[PDB]
Amino acid sequence: DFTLRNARMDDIDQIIKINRLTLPENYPYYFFVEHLKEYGLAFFVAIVDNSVVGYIMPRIEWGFSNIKQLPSLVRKGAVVSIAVLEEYRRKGIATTLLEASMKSMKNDYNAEEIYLAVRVSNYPAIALYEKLNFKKVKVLKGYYADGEDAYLMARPL
């Protein structure tokens, strides 16, 4: 009893509120907009009865691989941000969001790998990512504003 669709401009202040409720990393309005315009096909929301209850915001880029050691550039997707409102957690929504985004990154944007950063103490997200075959690649020391470390996590597409 949730449905998944691509995010639209009208979704964004609902998205921003979700972000502010669930996450310390609170991006300004234009940030969400630029990513919706640039990588929209992989940017999904989860809807319950006309309200947004979750989102995933993607990025697509050229960069060096986290999966293999090559001197040349590869096309990568990144999970910039993902959140599901507490009320609707453990229903498979974050899983459905990430799979939908990964599919688009692969098919619409020709990314060959995806990565993200997650707090070393965010054990629910880590568990989620690991169930989706994400692996720990690196520890990013003092990555977050409050000084906490991050796992850089990655997987092939």
Ligand X SMILES: CC(=O)SCCNC(=O)CCNC(=O)[C@H](O)C(C)(C)COP(=O)(O)OP(=O)(O)OC[C@H]1O[C@@H](n2cnc3c(N)ncnc32)[C@H](O)[C@@H]1OP(=O)(O)O
Selected from 112, 122, 126, 152, the binder of Ca ion by CB under 5 A is 122
103: number of Cβ within 10 Å: 14
- Judged by CB, which is closer to ligand X: 89, or 136? 89
Q: Does 89 bind ligand X (CB under 6 A)?
A: yes
Select 119 or 136, whichever has its Cβ closest to Ca ion: 119
> Which range binds Ca ion by CB under 5 A, 49-57, 80-88, 106-114, 116-124?
116-124
Beta pairing, strands 51-63 & 44-48: antiparallel
State how far the alpha carbon of 99 is from the alpha carbons of 73, 94, 121, 150, 154, in Å.
Answer: 24, 9, 23, 22, 14
Tokens coding 137: 């690649």
Please identify, among the stretches 31-39, 60-68, 74-82, 133-141, the one whose residues bind ligand X according to the rule CB under 6 A: 74-82
Pairing mode, if any, of strands 3-6 and 74-84? unpaired
| 36, 52, 60, 83: which one binds ligand X (CB under 6 A) | 83
Nearest to 6 by CA among 42, 59, 37: 42
User: Taking CB under 6 A as the rule, does residue 81 contact ligand X?
Assistant: yes
Residue nearest to Ca ion (CB): 119
Among 7, 15, 42, 118, the residue binding ligand X under the rule CB under 6 A is 118
Q: Are strands 113-119 and 74-84 parallel, antiparallel or unpaired?
A: parallel
Query: Does 122 interact with ligand X (rule: CB under 6 A)?
Result: yes
